[PDB]
C-alpha cells in the first residue's frame, strides 16, 4: 500500500479558484495582528472551499483576486474574502509552523502535517 500521509505536503504557492456564487466560502481564518499573516484554521465539510479540495488548515492566504493579504488585518481580510465576488481566486501557501502557534498543543510532524496532542 502507498499512503499519502507519508508524502510531504507541497510548500510552494498555489492558485485556487473557488466558484461559490452568493454563499460563504466555508472556512475560518486566524491571524492578522502585526503582519503575522492570515491562515486557514478550519474548513467546513461540504462548503465551497472543501469542494475545491485544494485548501487545508495551515494554509496562508497570500492574496484574493490579486489583493495582497500577506500583511492584512483579520477584519479587512474577512471583508476582502466576503466581497470577492462569485469567483474567488486565492493564492495560498502552506505554512504549518507559523499556523501552529495559534492552535493549542499543536506542532508539525516530519511530513509537514499539523498534529494536535
Amino acid at each position: 500500500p502507498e499512503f499519502l500521509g507519508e508524502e510531504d505536503i507541497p510548500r510552494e504557492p498555489r492558485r485556487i479558484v473557488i466558484h461559490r456564487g452568493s454563499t460563504g466560502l466555508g472556512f475560518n481564518i486566524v491571524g492578522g495582528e502585526d503582519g503575522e499573516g492570515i491562515f486557514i484554521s478550519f474548513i467546513l465539510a461540504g462548503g465551497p472551499a472543501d469542494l475545491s479540495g485544494e485548501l487545508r488548515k495551515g494554509d496562508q492566504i497570500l492574496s484574493v483576486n490579486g489583493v495582497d493579504l500577506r500583511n492584512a488585518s483579520a477584519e479587512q481580510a474577512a471583508i476582502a474574502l466576503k466581497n470577492a465576488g462569485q469567483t474567488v481566486t486565492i493564492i495560498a501557501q502552506y505554512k504549518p509552523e507559523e499556523y501552529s502557534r495559534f492552535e493549542a498543543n499543536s506542532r508539525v510532524d516530519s511530513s509537514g502535517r499539523i498534529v494536535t496532542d
Binding site: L25, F27, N28, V30, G32, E75, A78, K82
Partner: peptide
C-alpha cells in the same frame, strides 16, 4: 487574536 468565518 481574531478569528472569522468567511
Amino acid at each position: 487574536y481574531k478569528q472569522t468565518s468567511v
